[PDB]
Amino acid sequence: MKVRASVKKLCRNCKIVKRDGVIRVICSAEPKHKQRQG
Amino acid sequence: INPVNNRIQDLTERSDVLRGYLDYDAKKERLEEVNAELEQPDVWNEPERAQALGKERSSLEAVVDTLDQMKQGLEDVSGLLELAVEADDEETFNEAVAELDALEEKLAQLEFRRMFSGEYDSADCYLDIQAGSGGTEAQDWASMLERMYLRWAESRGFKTEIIKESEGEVAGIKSVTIKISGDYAYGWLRTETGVHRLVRKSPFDSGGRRHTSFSSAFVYPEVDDDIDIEINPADLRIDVYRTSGAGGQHVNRTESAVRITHIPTGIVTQCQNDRSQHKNKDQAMKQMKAKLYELEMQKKNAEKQAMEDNKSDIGWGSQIRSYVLDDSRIKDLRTGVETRNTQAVLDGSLDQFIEASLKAG
Amino acid sequence: TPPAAVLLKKAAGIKSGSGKPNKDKVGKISRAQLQEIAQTKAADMTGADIEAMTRSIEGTARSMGLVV
RNA sequence: GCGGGGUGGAGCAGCCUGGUAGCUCGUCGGGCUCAUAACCCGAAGGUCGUCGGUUCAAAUCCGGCCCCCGCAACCA
RNA sequence: AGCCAGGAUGUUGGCUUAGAAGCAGCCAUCAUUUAAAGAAAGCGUAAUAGCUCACUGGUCGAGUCGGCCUGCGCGGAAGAU
Ligand SMILES: [Mg+2]
Ligand SMILES: [Mg+2]
Ligand SMILES: [Mg+2]
Ligand SMILES: [Zn+2]
């Protein structure tokens, strides 16, 4: 999990999802791409 | 025609010399063994081993394929030369001459690489000549060696300058430092390092006795200037604290003394002379920079001192080239190359010895 | 059929011809030679018109670096 | 912060007061000597730290920049 | 959007490289088979391979795309009784 202020799609499989008032990037291909805004 | 045949024979001998210096049978067997190992599946089980075997195969393949193609080209050029001479074909003769020139340049590139495999062989060099056991005769001999090396550099087309010189009071020079600039100057001159023994009736002896004098030549490459590296601030730890013997409320309270520690090295500097923490930090940074530079300087001095201790003394038993003028013989102890034209050698015909030393490697 | 690149090299009489093609031409070939090359590989080549094979081989040579 | 300096290879002058570079050693050539030193007779070598300004004209006067020196840096 | 087919050839374009096959680069970057198939956009292989994908066909049957101006909100946002 990368927790940072600037969360972005890093590959074509990354998806932006807002869970519980938090912007998150979940990737079905690369676990390194998992991101949380914070 | 006959010069072309002589050239072909010289190239054949050079190719055989390359094959034997490289032990072409040994290299070919090693290449075959590497091929067998690489065909085996288990070879790639260790990626580092597989990559090392691949690079070794590439180098051995370069050498082996180059020689296998070279031999065939020489045989073909011999056949085409025979046909051209028989048929009196000037165009085919010129084409064969061009092919022989190209093949000679190719084999010469291989010869050049083998001659200068060293890392710094391409760089410019410095030559230092120092007189030794002969005394005044040694200083005169040193001057003779200086003249010889300058003439040889002129013959090779290199550019020479005299950085420093100390002349003997009676005659000759005590020492001289010369800068040589050119293509592969260090490679061409590096084999002349050592002590040169001279045997001739000393002109500085009233009885004209046959004395022996020694002079030392030392050749070292021109080192590139080091790039200055700024201290990476992530490599430093800075501590601020109260200075010792602090007098007064202000000084007792304030953190003015600064200590800087270099994490990679462990060297520490510290300054507390000034009232200002900023001034103390600047002075401590300057001292830390100076100490790192001094550490590098100590390393450089240690390398130089090891070289000075490695340098053989300029005296009996340290000769690698004997110039005996009474017997009119000059002999290199390392290679065994011997000549009788002492005058030519003193005038700068060092190519025989230098090429012999490089071929011996 | 044997590969086209080695045949192109054999026709050229050159060994290395790819470094910096447009900046300076290393080799060059003629169209008739290319066509003659093309006709011999007709069994495996995917085409009926030999002209198409010829221009494909020309394009291959151009990619290699040699200007037709 | 306040003062000084930087000129043939070395050490010193010339700056003040603009026009002009000197001394001693050192280097080079010729002598003397069997030879070296010493000695004797001749020569050469600095466009003045680095830029800029001012001036008809700058080693010189002014201003930066670099190096070197001194002092000062306190009550705290 | 999914979903089903496909998603070719010269050709691994050559060099430099240790190897370099679309996918280290350099370096050209074309024509052919045509519905379309990049001398490859990504993943991936030591390299291939392999996995996609761009492209295109076929079933389902109304929207879909992503910029511009603007209002209000969201994250970024840790301190000591
Ligand atoms: Mg006090
Ligand atoms: Mg003047
Ligand atoms: Mg806000
Ligand atoms: Zn992703």
- The alpha carbon dihedral of B44, B47, B49, B53 has a sign of positive
Cβ neighbours around B153 below 10 Å, total: 22
DSSP-assigned states of every residue in B216-257: EEEEEE-PPPPPP-PPPGGGEEEEEEPPTT--SHHHHH---E
Strands A14-19 and B159-167: unpaired
Q: Does the CB of B44 fall within 7 Å of any strand E atom?
A: yes
Token pair for A28? 């079905």
Rounded CA gap, B282 and C16, in Å?
59
Sorted by sequence, the CB contacts under 8 Å of residue B149 that are 6+ apart come out as B127, B129, B178, B189, B192, B217, B348, B350
Q: Does the CB of A29 fall within 7 Å of any strand E atom?
A: yes
- The alpha carbon dihedral of C54, C55, C56, C60 has a sign of positive
Rounded CA gap, B129 and B77, in Å?
47
Q: How far is residue C3 from each of residues B30, B332, C38, C40, measured CA to CA in Å?
A: 31, 57, 11, 12
The residue whose two tokens read 């103390």 is B280
Nucleotides of D under 7 A from a protein CB: 35-37, 73-76
C3-25 burial code (b ≥16 CB/10 A, e <16): ebeebbbebbebeebeeebeeee
Measure B175 CA to ligand 2 centroid, in angstroms: 42
Tell me, in Å, the resolution of the deposited structure. 2.8
Contact indicator for B16, B74 with CB cutoff of 8 Å: no
Phi, psi of B352 (to 5 degrees): -60, -50
List all chains that touch chain B, counting a touch as 3 or more CB pairs closer than 8 Å.
Answer: none
Phi, psi of B142 (to 5 degrees): -65, -40
Rounded CA gap, A38 and A25, in Å?
12
DSSP letter (8 states) at residue C17: -
DSSP letter (8 states) at residue A33: G
Rounded CA gap, B63 and B74, in Å?
16
Rounded CA gap, B110 and B14, in Å?
10
Sorted by sequence, the CB contacts under 8 Å of residue B159 that are 6+ apart come out as B153, B180, B181, B182
Rounded CA gap, B197 and C2, in Å?
67
A3-36 burial code (b ≥16 CB/10 A, e <16): eeeebeeeeeebeeeeeeeeebbebeeeeebbbe
List the one residue out of C61, C63, C68 whose CA is nearest residue C9: C61
Domains of chain C (ranges plus CATH)?
1-68 (1.10.10.250)
Three-state DSSP class for B46?
A: coil
Token pair for B227? 């790039």
3-state secondary structure B305-325: HHHHHHCCCCCCCCEEEEEEC
What's the full length of chain A, in residues?
A: 38
Subset of residues 6-65 in chain C with CB less than 7 angstroms from any atom in strand E: 9, 16-23, 45-47, 49, 52, 55-57, 59-60, 62-65
List the one residue out of A18, A12, A17 whose CA is nearest residue A30: A12
List the one residue out of B188, B180, B165 whose CA is nearest residue B127: B180
AA letter at C59: G
Three-state DSSP class for B270?
A: strand
Q: Please list the alpha-helical segments (H only) found in chain C.
A: 4-12, 31-40, 50-64
Helix, strand, coil abundance in chain B, percent, nearest 5: 55, 20, 25
Contact indicator for B246, B252 with CB cutoff of 8 Å: yes
Token pair for B277? 């923490």
Three-state DSSP class for B283?
A: helix
Q: Does the CB of B170 fall within 7 Å of any strand D atom?
A: yes
